[PDB]
Structure 1
Amino acid sequence: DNHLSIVTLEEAPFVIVEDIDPETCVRNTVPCRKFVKINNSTNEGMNVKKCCKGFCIDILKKLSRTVKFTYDLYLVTNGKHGKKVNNVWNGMIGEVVYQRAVMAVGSLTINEERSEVVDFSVPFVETGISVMVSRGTQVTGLSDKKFQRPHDYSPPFRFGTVPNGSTERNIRNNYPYMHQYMTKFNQKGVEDALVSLKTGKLDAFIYDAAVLNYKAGRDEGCKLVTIGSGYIFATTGYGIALQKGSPWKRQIDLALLQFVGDGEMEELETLWLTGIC
């Protein structure tokens, strides 16, 4: 019982999805399947063979080798990272909860409500909530009065997040006025948000610290920056989600702690996350 069903989600540079050789998965890529629908009037669809790489994919390769398991990697199609709807989990969290996956590998934020339904590994990427602005925008951080009391300003500060993830959940829990205000500025994804920040349609973009630090490091002309020295509110980490009571957790934690000690994590950070800016 060594061959494991593993779920992932694309989010550069953590998980990058590519098309297969027009015949298999070359280089540092691993095979990952994605279930694609024939149409929207059916449940019928087909698995499309893709290729996966990135920081989290390298961690999965090291774990597979160290912990001695083989796997069938697939991309989640029902939601993204994980959202609880009327006590029903979707995304990568849902796949683990409903036992369609042994583990979820990716840019998956550890938080209290997810920890109630899945077991998380020790953290292996430092993250939390950061604020991206165009260089020169004056905000102290998430607790600035421009965020906390937006209508005290003329015109009010325009800021949003990509909903349904750990960032929105945290803001909903901590800052009720800010949350109900932000919803008109919900962004479909990170690429749309960055373009809204550049087209002057958004003043600030609040999201996962690790992904924003990466995007700031590669921004063309280094126009978009994270506030402070890349300050992190609600500090947390990415972790591997495993089913509660999983026999795999002990060895995965021990292997991740071994990787940090040997400087193997620092190498992955150099290879995938560092940038020009």
Structure 2
Amino acid sequence: LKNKTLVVTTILSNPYCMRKESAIPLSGNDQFEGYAVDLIHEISKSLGFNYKIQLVPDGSYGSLNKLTGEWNGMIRELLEQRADLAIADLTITFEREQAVDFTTPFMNLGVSILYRKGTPIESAEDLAKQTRIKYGALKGGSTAAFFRDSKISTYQRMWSFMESARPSVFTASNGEGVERVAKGKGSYAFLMESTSIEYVTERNCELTQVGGMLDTKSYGIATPPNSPYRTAINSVILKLQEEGKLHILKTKWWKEKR
């Protein structure tokens, strides 16, 4: 890895990878900033390679066409050898790990609830046993998928409530869901990743996360299968974690920058 150059696939997603706020055009890696940009910088420092950030062209993380065997997104880019590393808010999942390899996690998370502050609602269970408060998710997102496939009775009942609701509780973006909570006066809760919720609550003091996590998953760096660099990056992630550098990066991007 010393004196090598890697292509890093990523995806625009706040605050992991973002276009910098400057009217002056920026070139190459310089146009981007965020937690993932800083993470690959720290990994490249420890291991001494150069890299080039390329946004994934189809703007997708990676899903499998069960019928055709066809992948899209960042996963496809690794499998086609157009990227050496995928560094993003990319979840380690069973389906993806059949096609690519993942490092140990650099961030942990789970589905949770975004709601208004100062209510009696304390848990998913308080939502499910009632009908006045509506709740939804990003249409066709990973949170919607979790509820669709859950066989935990509480969440199966919640997906049932979600699909049976009219007008529609699903949103076309997470900023639309956040607005629906912010303007809903308690009539609407939004389901998304806990990391996304933290980012929102840092910037909207009337909003809060309700309860804990409804599932447990992680973001890791994905590599082509049997990549010769996964094991070296694993050690770097654990070192950065233990030194507190990942905690600093999270504080920086969730609480300091905007």
Q: Could you say whether these structures have the same fold, taking a TM-score greater than 0.5 normalized by the shorter chain as the test? A: yes
1:219-267 CA distance string (max 9 Å, x none): 1xx1111013xx2221222111111111110111011111122222222
Corresponding residue number in structure 1 for 2:237: 256
| Larger displacement relative to structure 2 (93-102 or 110-119) | 93-102
The answer as to 2:189 corresponding to 1:189 is no
Give yes or no for contact 2:11–2:59 (8 Å, CA) kept in 1.
no
Q: Give the 5 Å matches for 1:84-103.
A: 84-86=64-66, 87-103=69-85
Runs of 4 or more off by more than 6 Å in structure 1?
none
Partners of 1:185 and 1:251 lie apart in 2 by: 44
Q: Aligned in 2, Cα 1:91/1:23: closer, same or farther, shift over 3 Å?
A: closer
Report the secondary structure of 1:74's partner residue.
Answer: strand
Q: Give the 5 Å matches for 1:71-90.
A: 71-86=51-66, 87-90=69-72
1:165-221 CA distance string (max 9 Å, x none): 4322322221445335435322122211111112229611111111111211221xx
CA shift for structure 1 position 145:
5.9
1:102-124 CA distance string (max 9 Å, x none): 21111112222222222111111
Match of 1:208 among 179, 182, 193: 193
Amino acid at match of 1:73: I
Corresponding residue number in structure 2 for 1:60: 40
Corresponding residue number in structure 2 for 1:224: 207
Structure 2: where are the runs of 5+ without partners?
Answer: none
Q: Give the 5 Å matches for 1:99-248.
A: 99-142=81-124, 144=125, 146-147=127-128, 153=131, 155=132, 157-174=133-150, 175-179=155-159, 181-182=161-162, 184-200=168-184, 203-219=188-204, 222-228=205-211, 231-248=212-229
Amino acid at match of 2:32: C
Corresponding residue number in structure 2 for 1:39: none
| Larger displacement relative to structure 2 (108-117 or 207-216) | 108-117
CA shift for structure 1 position 64:
1.4
Give yes or no for contact 2:135–2:162 (8 Å, CA) kept in 1.
yes
Partners of 1:81 and 1:240 lie apart in 2 by: 12
Partners of 1:20 and 1:75 lie apart in 2 by: 19
Give yes or no for contact 2:103–2:234 (8 Å, CA) kept in 1.
yes
CA shift for structure 1 position 93:
2.6
Corresponding residue number in structure 2 for 1:47: none
Report the secondary structure of 2:19's partner residue.
Answer: strand
TM-score, scaled to structure 1: 0.78
Report the secondary structure of 1:100's partner residue.
Answer: coil
Give yes or no for contact 1:14–1:106 (8 Å, CA) kept in 2.
yes
Partners of 1:134 and 1:80 lie apart in 2 by: 30
Give yes or no for contact 2:62–2:72 (8 Å, CA) kept in 1.
yes
Amino acid at match of 1:204: A
Number of aligned residue pairs: 244
Give yes or no for contact 2:112–2:214 (8 Å, CA) kept in 1.
yes
Partners of 1:185 and 1:177 lie apart in 2 by: 15
Give yes or no for contact 1:119–1:245 (8 Å, CA) kept in 2.
yes
Amino acid at match of 1:105: I
